[PDB]
Amino acid sequence: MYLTLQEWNARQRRPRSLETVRRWVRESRIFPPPVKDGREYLFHESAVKVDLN
DNA sequence: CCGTTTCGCTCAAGTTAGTATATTAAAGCTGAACGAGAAACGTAAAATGATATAAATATCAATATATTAAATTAGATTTTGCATAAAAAACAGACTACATAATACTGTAAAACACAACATATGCAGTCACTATGCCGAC
């Protein structure tokens, strides 16, 4: 039902580095926000990179 | 015959009189689309009606006499309806043997990300020009 960090970024237009994407998570730059499974984050299929300011 | 006024009528805004239901549950009605077998029809071919005349063949009464198909039995027998029961095969009721998954437990690489000092393009911060009629002023 959810999508892994890589499976979500791979679908993006400008696939950034893993670290950078992980940073948009701690900075709540992604809404709807992703949930932490065990060691990886599983975002939503409709989750988008909300760039504000 | 004619006009004028009262009266029968209907429109418009108040003043009263009367009666009281919603969901379940299960049908029932009817316009419209769907899917074969048997007999009346019809053109074509085969059998028959049409048609007549001297000669050939059948029409039939009344009774004697040899002949024969065949229903009428009458006894013989395959045929037909119905189980009984055991030989023979199917198949749960047991069980160890065998190969196979879910699980028990040790061994090892590596995914996934916080944490931390830099590095720096890029968006944001701050000011002037691009581009063209307002407003204000005359006509």
UniProtKB/Swiss-Prot annotation:
Ranges annotated as spanning the membrane: none
The keyword DNA-binding belongs to this UniProt entry's keyword annotation: yes
Entry GO MF terms: DNA binding; identical protein binding
Keyword terms of this UniProt record: DNA recombination, DNA-binding, Viral genome excision
GO BP annotations, alphabetical order: DNA recombination; provirus excision
Subunit structure: Interacts (via C-terminus) with the integrase (via N-terminus). Part of the excision complex made of the integrase tetramer, IHF, Fis and Xis.
Functional note: Part of the excision complex necessary for the excision of prophage from the host genome by site-specific recombination at the att site.
Protein's name in the database: Excisionase
Lineage: Viruses, Duplodnaviria, Heunggongvirae, Uroviricota, Caudoviricetes
